[PDB]
Design a protein around this nucleic acid. Structure first.
Ligand SMILES: [K+]
Ligand SMILES: [K+]
Ligand SMILES: [K+]
Ligand SMILES: [K+]
Ligand SMILES: [K+]
Ligand SMILES: [K+]
Ligand SMILES: [Mg+2]
Ligand SMILES: [Mg+2]
Ligand SMILES: [Mg+2]
Ligand SMILES: [Mg+2]
Ligand SMILES: [Mg+2]
Ligand SMILES: [Mg+2]
Ligand SMILES: [Mg+2]
Ligand SMILES: [Mg+2]
Ligand SMILES: [Mg+2]
Ligand SMILES: [Mg+2]
Ligand SMILES: [Mg+2]
Ligand SMILES: [Mg+2]
Ligand SMILES: [Mg+2]
Ligand SMILES: [Mg+2]
Ligand SMILES: [Mg+2]
Ligand SMILES: [Mg+2]
Ligand SMILES: [Mg+2]
Lengths: 90, 95, 58, 59, 42
RNA sequence: UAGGAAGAGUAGUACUGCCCGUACCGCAAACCGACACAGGUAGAUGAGGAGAGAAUCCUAAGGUGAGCGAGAGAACUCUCG
RNA sequence: GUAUGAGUAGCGAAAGAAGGGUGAGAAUCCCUUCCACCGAAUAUCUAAGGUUUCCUGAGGAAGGCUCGUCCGCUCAGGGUUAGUCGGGACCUAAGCCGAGGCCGAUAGGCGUAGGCGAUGGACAACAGGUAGAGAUUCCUGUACCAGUGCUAAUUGUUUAAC
RNA sequence: GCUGUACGUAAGCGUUGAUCCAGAGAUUUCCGAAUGGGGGAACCCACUAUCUUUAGUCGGAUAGUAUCCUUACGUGAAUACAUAGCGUGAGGAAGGCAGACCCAGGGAACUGAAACAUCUAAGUACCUGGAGGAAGAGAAAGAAAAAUCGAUUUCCUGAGUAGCGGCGAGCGAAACGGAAAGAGCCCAAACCAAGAAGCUUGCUUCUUGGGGUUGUAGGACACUCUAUACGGAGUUACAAAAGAAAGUUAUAAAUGAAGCGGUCUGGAAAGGCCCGCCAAAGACGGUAACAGCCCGGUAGUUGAAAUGGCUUUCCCUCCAGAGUGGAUCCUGAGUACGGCGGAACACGUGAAAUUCCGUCGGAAUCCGGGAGGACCAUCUCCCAAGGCUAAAUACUCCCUAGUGAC
């Protein structure tokens, strides 16, 4: 269920700035684990993963007039690969 | 709806009474029909990604279905409609 | 708390006085905790003196 | 779907895997801004649904 | 000082769902709040 | 010690190491006080001269110039001399 | 709902000034320089609590007791990286729950084993960089704890290395 | 034609039949009785098995693992057989609601009495437990009286009567009568049979089958006659659990008459004027203004693949019942009653029957026993201390169609 653990990449200026150091920012299932993410990325892209970082984000409050609600709860992994491996592209 | 896209149509009531036209669109969620040359109306359109010149545009608006009557493409005259089964295919019938 | 045989137990009524003042009280049963055979084996159970004066084996 | 029922319980799961790969690539393209056709998402997702469904039906 | 001096732990262990559902008379509170239809039970 | 025991520990290697929190305020305009409220809010650090001293006066590093102003300088009220 | 008082009381302890700049507009925003205030604090950390108030870019309707080109305001995008920090998968205290059990009109009350429960005990990483936003987390170096396999030696076989 | 409210832009699907509607299925994260253990709700940490990945750690799938009750089985202490206990398996429950209706347990006060205590308010409010679609009650140990009636319940009356009551305030029936609705049954016991347990030791005393259930007394037991599926009954009691078919209905729908009539006003005609028409269809709503003839539709007539219900048929299941005798035997025991203390009956201890609770005592059992408002006799009516039972009654979170001098 690699394709279900790894939902999306996180395309932002921070992320792109960080890609040159062979680090990849993925958005992931909130129940995933660091180790699952490791083996899933290794599966899905045939890279070697050295280290995997992960943070959890609360949902931000937004409005559209009379109607408030929190954006979805996010979990952002930052995989990094062994230097002697092939890159994930974006 | 007793009137369908692609039909030829007469207008019963309204300011455009007596006129005729094709059915360019239908809205059964509202029981309205979009008919050529009927209920032409002037939209004051600021320029945007399309209509980037902008302007006052004459275009057709919808009018209700009950104000409208179908025309038999063989006679060319207006006909109230019934339904019959040809073989195993329901169809529309003039009367 | 109730007799295992005829399930008699605390019921409730009034305590009346001279002057017929009504107050509230309970009539408890004379339940004694003694052995009997509930089944082919024994057990130490609340049982009532009424039920005990003849017919049940300790 | 009728075309889908002609498959013997493993080709069906292989197509499921393939559709999962395709869907991941589409979510990736979309997150990157590179996807022109957005309605292929629903189509692939519903194909997956049908395959899991007929698998269970045979089970 | 003043009378509300907050604490999450105290709040939940007094007024929280498990404290309500531990007690016969706290399940009535929840039955009564579901009966009014409140968005929030505790 | 009771026990279990056919595998045991030594060195060097390479690899592996989960979940939650981590922003920001935090003597404060973000906490408790209905307020951008002269109130209250635990602990670690907390320099110099003179000094017993964390007192006091002036100050260092560092923070601030406090969310209405200017200008007349009259009785009365307040705080001061 | 609107008056009256009434353009009245009040505008919430405190030192500002000028020059440049931005801008439709400046006592009020930005910069500079002098000046002044705190300094066992009016500084630096950090709990609890609050929960995005943080950063960036636009904005000035309302909020801000004035003003506003600004904000803890509004929009939109971003931002919180841990084997070693703190809490769990480690321990328990007061207390709480409590199989069975003892009590008791019911409902339930007490309570053993057992288990939860820190404000305590145990437990292995330090110094620098980080020009928008995190740092014992990331990066650079140098390490430590626990385990695993691969090699290379050594040892042990049922009066039994471990 | 469509991708909801919800515009928007983008991208797309649809007569090789979409969107939509109906039926049945599948999927159904985490929490919650929540049940693998914990827990501050929607979070955390696991074990055991099989498989899988890794060079191997690390990691991943899937299944099971709560407590209690009953029931079997196996283990198993002091203690010697054994029981307790422990474990496993097969069932079952747990919790919620409709702030409604009812059954029980427990049970106020304000108030009223122009104070107030008996009394009232009131067995109300409230707590709790049990439920079920109704519940409760119920097939006479009855109601009654010169005459009988024949299970309960609900309604009208009786009646604001009889009566209760600091005889104050106030509480207040029942039966006859008339109606709705209707329905009757099962055990216990003697007695026969088997089995096991005591050897109660030639007797009991427990588990099942038959038998039998009631008041002019009935039954067992003796005989005669029938009866073994001839016929009958049934899951609404009288035993219980299934299955088909047919029809009907509900949950989608289809068809469905007749004016584009002319003219006037008008932004627009459904309105005014003049002509017609349909009607088993002049319900409603909509449409540029008040439409039977514009639209959806209505009356009417049709139709349902699938599922659900109901009514019939079949299957299936299961079924001794009259008579005459009456040697003998049985017919609900720590109850029925009584004393004491309380309560419910309209009935406040009152002359206090009747019913119930607690505690003491404590019957006869068929030449017997109860009731008829203390009680006695006579007469009359009836068989308790065991159980089941639809309908008529009460209520409405809900569904469908509809109504309102709201
Ligand atoms: K000092
Ligand atoms: K601590
Ligand atoms: K009943
Ligand atoms: K009408
Ligand atoms: K009496
Ligand atoms: K009688
Ligand atoms: Mg972390
Ligand atoms: Mg910080
Ligand atoms: Mg000020
Ligand atoms: Mg004045
Ligand atoms: Mg003033
Ligand atoms: Mg000081
Ligand atoms: Mg800011
Ligand atoms: Mg302002
Ligand atoms: Mg703990
Ligand atoms: Mg920072
Ligand atoms: Mg009074
Ligand atoms: Mg009008
Ligand atoms: Mg009597
Ligand atoms: Mg008495
Ligand atoms: Mg009474
Ligand atoms: Mg008595
Ligand atoms: Mg008499």
């Amino acid at each position: 269920d690699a394709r279900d653990i790894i939902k999306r990449p996180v395309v932002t200026e921070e992320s792109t700035s960080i890609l040159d150091d062979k680090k990849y920012t993925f958005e992931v299932d909130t129940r995933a684990t660091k180790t699952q993410v490791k083996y899933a990325v290794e599966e899905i892209f045939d890279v070697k993963v050295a280290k995997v970082n992960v943070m959890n984000y609360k949902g931000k409050l937004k409005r559209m007039g009379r109607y408030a609600g929190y954006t979805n709860k996010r979990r952002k992994a930052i995989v990094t690969v062994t230097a002697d491996s092939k890159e994930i592209q974006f | 709806m007793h009137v369908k896209k692609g039909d030829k149509v007469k207008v019963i009531t309204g300011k455009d009474k007596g006129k005729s036209g094709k059915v360019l669109a239908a809205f059964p969620k509202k029981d309205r029909v979009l008919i050529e040359g009927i209920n032409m109306v002037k939209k004051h359109t600021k320029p945007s990604n399309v209509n980037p010149q902008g302007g006052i545009l004459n275009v057709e608006a919808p009018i209700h279905v009950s104000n409208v009557m179908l025309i038999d493409p063989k006679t060319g005259e207006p006909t109230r409609v019934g339904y019959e089964v040809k073989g195993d295919k329901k169809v529309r019938v003039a009367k | 708390k109730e007799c295992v045989i005829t399930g008699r137990k605390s019921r409730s009524g009034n305590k009346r006085s001279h002057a017929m003042n009504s107050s509230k009280r309970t009539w408890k049963a004379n339940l004694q905790k003694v052995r009997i055979l509930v089944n082919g084996k024994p057990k130490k159970v609340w049982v009532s003196a009424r039920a005990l004066k003849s017919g049940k084996v300790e | 779907a009728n075309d889908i029922r002609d498959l013997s319980t493993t080709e069906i799961q292989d197509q499921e895997k393939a559709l999962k790969e395709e869907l991941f690539n589409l979510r990736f393209q979309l997150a990157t801004g590179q996807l022109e056709n957005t309605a292929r998402i629903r189509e692939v997702r519903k194909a997956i649904a049908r395959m899991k469904t007929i698998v269970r039906e045979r089970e | 000082k003043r009378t509300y001096q907050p604490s999450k732990r105290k709040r939940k262990k007094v007024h929280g769902f498990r404290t309500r559902m531990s007690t016969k008379n706290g399940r009535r509170v929840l039955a009564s709040r579901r009966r009014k239809g409140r968005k929030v039970l505790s």
